[PDB]
Design a protein around this ligand. Structure first.
Ligand SMILES: [Ca+2]
Lengths: 40, 95
């Protein structure tokens, strides 16, 4: 039952900390136009 | 034929530099939100990270990141992403 912490990455990853301290989207997006189209 | 064509590399160097990098390397605290530049979720963004950081030094080198961001557009460009390392995009610098 020791599996409350089960970050499935190789420690080098800064996303394995999901749903705890990850919500930090930067307005540096090169995908600004992508979100305007999406369906294609 | 390294996937990050010098045109995209230089473009990635532009976003790279814009983050005020560390010796030509960027790390997850900066890179992740440039990953979150997309509508992509941290599962793919993280998988991309783990693949894109070839040397696994914990930092994304100019080449390693060029790899990452190339894979980021790949997902947005409606192209399925691999979980294995495609040597066409394994940075010749890091080989
Ligand atoms: Ca690295």
């Amino acid at each position: 039952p020791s599996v409350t912490e089960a970050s499935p990455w190789r420690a080098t990853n800064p996303f394995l900390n999901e749903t705890l301290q990850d919500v930090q989207p930067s307005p540096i997006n090169p995908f600004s136009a992508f979100f305007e189209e999406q369906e294609r | 034929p390294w996937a990050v064509k010098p045109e995209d590399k230089a473009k990635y160097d532009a976003i790279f530099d814009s983050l005020s990098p560390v010796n030509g390397f960027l790390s997850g605290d900066k890179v992740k939100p440039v990953l979150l530049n997309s509508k992509l979720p941290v599962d793919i963004l993280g998988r991309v990270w783990e693949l894109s950081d070839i040397d696994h030094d914990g930092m994304l080198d100019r080449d390693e990141f060029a790899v990452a961001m190339f894979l980021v557009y790949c997902a947005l460009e409606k192209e399925p992403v691999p979980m294995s390392l495609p040597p066409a995009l394994v940075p010749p610098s890091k080989r």
